[PDB]
Amino acid sequence: NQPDWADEAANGAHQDAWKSLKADVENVYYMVKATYKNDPVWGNDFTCVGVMANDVNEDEKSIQAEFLFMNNADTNMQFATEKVTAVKMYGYNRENAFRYETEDGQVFTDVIAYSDDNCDVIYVPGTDGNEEGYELWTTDYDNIPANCLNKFNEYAVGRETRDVFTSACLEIAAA
Numbered sequence: 001n002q003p004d005w006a007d008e009a010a011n012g013a014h015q016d017a018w019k020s021l022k023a024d025v026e027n028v029y030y031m032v033k034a035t036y037k038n039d040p041v042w043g044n045d046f047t048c049v050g051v052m053a054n055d056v057n058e059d060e061k062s063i064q065a066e067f068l069f070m071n072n073a074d075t076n077m078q079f080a081t082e083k084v085t086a087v088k089m090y091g092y093n094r095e096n097a098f099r100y101e102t103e104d105g106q107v108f109t110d111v112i113a114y115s116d117d118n119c120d121v122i123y124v125p126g127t128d129g130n131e132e133g134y135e136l137w138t139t140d141y142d143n144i145p146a147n148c149l150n151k152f153n154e155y156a157v158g159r160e161t162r163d164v165f166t167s168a169c170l171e172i173a174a175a
């Protein structure tokens, strides 16, 4: 059993996990929307999630990712570092998933449902002690690409979508 969009022949061209992970090195990615409220690491009613990477390791298809996030337990922005590795899921031959590993050794494996140059639609299977659902990540939290947004809305149909990282996360400007 696997999601109907998890068809490598049909959709693999837009499910390149390693390319998507390496993209975190040049630009910060913001999780702009999701269909679930709680994450074991980011917290409850989490918002303002962003990520940037460094230390690309081609041999391992891994990066060291630095995250920022907020939740209802603290008014201040929170930060964490996790290793993320491009791995295979759903029988794919080319890596289509992200294996996150926290400093405490906790592992989460999420799957790229759709990805374009500056945005990703990610599926959380819900088997890592977490809620099953979808996430939408983009490099510009104010200008969301239509292709990814449409794919996110298509795959996430029947759920409750909510904003995660928005301009409300920051107090921009001066005086």
Ligand SMILES: NCCc1c[nH]cn1
Pocket (backbone or CB within 6 Å): 020, 021, 023, 024, 029, 051, 065, 084, 098, 120, 137
């Ligand atoms: N471009 C990939 C965005 C992301 C989500 N999780 C880790 N990185």
Ligand SMILES: NCCc1c[nH]cn1
Pocket (backbone or CB within 6 Å): 039, 040, 041, 042, 082, 100, 108, 110, 124
């Ligand atoms: N779906 C996000 C799981 C995760 C990875 N790191 C922290 N939380």
